[PDB]
Structure formats: C-alpha cells, structure tokens
Amino acid sequence: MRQTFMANESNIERKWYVIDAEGQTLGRLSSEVASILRGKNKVTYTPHVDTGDYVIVINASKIEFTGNKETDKVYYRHSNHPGGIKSITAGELRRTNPERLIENSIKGMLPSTRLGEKQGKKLFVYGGAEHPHAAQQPENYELRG
Amino acid sequence: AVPKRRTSKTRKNKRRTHFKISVPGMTECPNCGEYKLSHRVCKNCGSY
C-alpha cells in the first residue's frame, strides 16, 4: 500500500463528444461508446469513482443491421401479469422509437451497479442530425478502425 | 399462524413510527388568560 494514484471528485474533468451513427453497425458502435462512457480511455481510470465522458449519439436513425436481423432479432418483455410477454422486432423498433433501440443496446454493455447506471445517464441519443446541447461545446469523436 | 423469525429491534421501531399522539386544540381563553379546548367550555370559571 504504497504510491498509487486514485482519482476522486475535485480531481475529475469530464468532456462532451458527438458521434454519428450514419453507416455504423448497431452493436459494433455500441461497444466503443460504452468504453468512452466508463472512463477506460483515460490514464486515471479509478474503478470506484465515476470517470468517463458524455456522449451524444447524433443520428441514430441510419444505424445498420446485417444478415436477417431486421425481421429476426425480436425483443421481449414481461408486464409481470400472467401471460404478459410482448415483443417487437429490431426493424420495427427502428421505424418506431429508434433512440430506445440504441439506448438499450449500450446499456446492456455496462455493469448493473449503482455506479454502472449512474454512467449510462451520461448518454444522449437522437434520431436525426440535431442535438439541443449546443451550449456544452461538444467535440467530435471518430470510431477506431 | 405463528411468527417464523423473531422481530429485530430495527423492524420493531419502524412499525412504531406512526404510533404516537398529537396535542389537543387548546386555545387560550379570553375571559381568563388560560387554556381550553376549542369549542368546549372553560374548566376555570366556566364561560363560553
């Protein structure tokens, strides 16, 4: 228990990025955003403290699936009432509410602790090429590869 | 029909959160500077 830096509040500096989902694959974009979102690209990554940045997934209406996942790839839920499953296909949740589609994909790639879901609240997804956060000075981030 | 575990002291003091009583209305009397219940007679030179 010697010299090892540990970041904390009053030591953290969070930023804002814009990211375009125009031409990207759904789950291959979702996984770089979850690493930006969780503070694992910064040298001062501390596990018990919220590092990480804010991300604005700008477009979100042009995200792409591959194969037959437009009519395959059904999403299920239960109302907690008897016989209460409900389902929607991946291509229909893009024609209807294409922001919930990207929000639920990235959130399944974060932990389910109190900190893990304080971090998915730094996620803002928009269908269409405009965001209302122009006052936060968002930069631009490119997906590797 | 019968308790399966005993009740801890913590769980007992939470149930008793609402087992309390409130003070009465108890305004002051104009005839004698005193205290009486609202809408009742004064128990001290009974006036109303």
Partner: protein, 112 residues
C-alpha cells in the same frame, strides 16, 4: 440551573407513560401544565404532579423564577414487575405482567 423530581414505582407500564412525555419534552413549563391537564390519558394526572413538584423545588430550594422555566428532560425508566396469572381454557395458566415506572422531570431556566 436545574431542578429535579422523581416518582418511583408508579404502577403504569413504561410504554404507556412514554407517549405523554414526548408531548412536553422541550416545552415551556407554563404550556406543559396545560397540555397535561387538557389530555385524556391515564398517566397525565401522575406526570403533572411530578412536573409541579419540580417547579416547586426550583423556587423554594434554589430561588428560581417560574416564568422562564422549561422542561429540559422527561423520561420514564422501567421499574420492577409483578408476576400474575390468568387461568385459560383447559387447565393451563398464562402470565400477566404488572409493570411499573420510574418518572423523572428536569426543569431549567436556561442559563450558565
């Protein structure tokens, strides 16, 4: 300064005395006399002649001024229990507790 009064082994369960002490704790003694004689609970006549005895100890023994006296501390301690019985349906008895209380009331003029 402070003045004290106690009533030992008053035959009322300490759970029941405690509801009425939470009404006068921290009140001005002129307002707490009235709360106790305008309340319908069984311990109220007993608690207020512990309160009037503490105000009497304040003026006579300690030369205080009753106008600015306050209820500083009021509490009930468990006294010793009596053992009783109740006969039941088919030859068996069950236990009755006859529980008592020690009652303490401290008044203070709030100075140092």
């Amino acid at each position: 300064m402070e003045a004290k009064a106690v009533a030992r082994t008053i035959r009322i369960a300490p759970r029941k005395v405690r509801l009425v002490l939470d009404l006068i704790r921290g009140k001005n003694a002129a307002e707490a006399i009235a709360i106790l004689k305008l309340t319908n609970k069984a311990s109220s006549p007993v608690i207020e002649k512990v309160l009037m005895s503490a105000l009497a100890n304040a003026e006579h023994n300690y030369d205080m001024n009753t106008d600015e006296l306050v209820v500083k501390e009021a509490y009930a301690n468990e006294g010793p229990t009596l053992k009783r019985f109740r006969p039941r349906a088919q030859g068996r008895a069950s236990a009755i507790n006859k529980r008592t209380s020690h009652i303490t009331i401290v008044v203070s003029d709030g100075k140092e």
